[PDB]
Structures are given as C-alpha cells and as structure tokens.
C-alpha cells in the first residue's frame, strides 16, 4: 500500500515476529527445567524405611 502509516503497522509486526521466533523458544527451556524438577521431586521423596 502507498500509505506509510499502513505499512508502518505491518512492519512493526514483522519486527516483533522477528524476535518472537527467538524468545518463544525459551519456553522449551522451561519445559526441560520443569520436567527435570519433577523427577528430582519423585526421587528425593522416594520411599526409604
């Protein structure tokens, strides 16, 4: 579109998307931690008498 204000909005999305591709992957690190903690909680609380 000839409107610079219109493209200005579509360009902000592309710049946001440019970073979301990166930051959204740190949720993978959250899973690996949460999954690693749940195992430690099961082992540390495992039965020993």
């Amino acid at each position: 579109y000839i409107s610079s204000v219109a493209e200005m909005m579509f360009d902000y999305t592309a710049c946001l998307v440019f970073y979301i591709r990166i930051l959204a992957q740190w949720i993978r690190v959250v899973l690996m931690v949460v999954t690693f903690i749940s195992l430690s909680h099961y082992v540390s609380d495992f039965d020993i008498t």
Partner: protein, 68 residues
C-alpha cells in the same frame, strides 16, 4: 489397624514438610529422609502414680494404726 488419631506433632529431617493430619484420609508412611511422626500411634492421655516402696508403706500403716 485403624488410622491413628490425627496428631500434628512431627519431626523433619531434610526439609520442612508442613504436615497436616487433616489433609489426607490415611496417614502416609514415614520416610526416613522426610518425616518422623510422634510416638504412640495408638495412645491416650492418662494419669498414673508410682507405687511407694513396700517398707515405706509399712511405716505409714504403723503410724496410722498407732494414731487411731
């Protein structure tokens, strides 16, 4: 054996568990590294008295007898 009457007294080993005897129906087993429960799983509160020595009792009997 019945579930022991709820008793909040407990002893921690590794970390504070915040044991609540009212949060579970059956009391979970005591793991060595987690908790030790209070003594007397099946116990009540009573009042008792020691029995004085026999020779001390005979001196008390002789005093009352000589008294009356």
């Amino acid at each position: 054996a019945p579930n022991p009457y709820p008793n909040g007294i407990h002893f921690d080993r590794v970390f504070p568990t915040h044991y609540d005897p009212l949060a579970e129906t059956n009391r979970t087993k005591a793991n060595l590294q987690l908790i030790k429960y209070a003594p007397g799983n099946y116990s009540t509160l009573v009042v008792t008295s020691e029995k004085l020595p026999r020779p001390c009792i005979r001196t008390i009997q002789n005093y009352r007898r000589c008294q009356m």
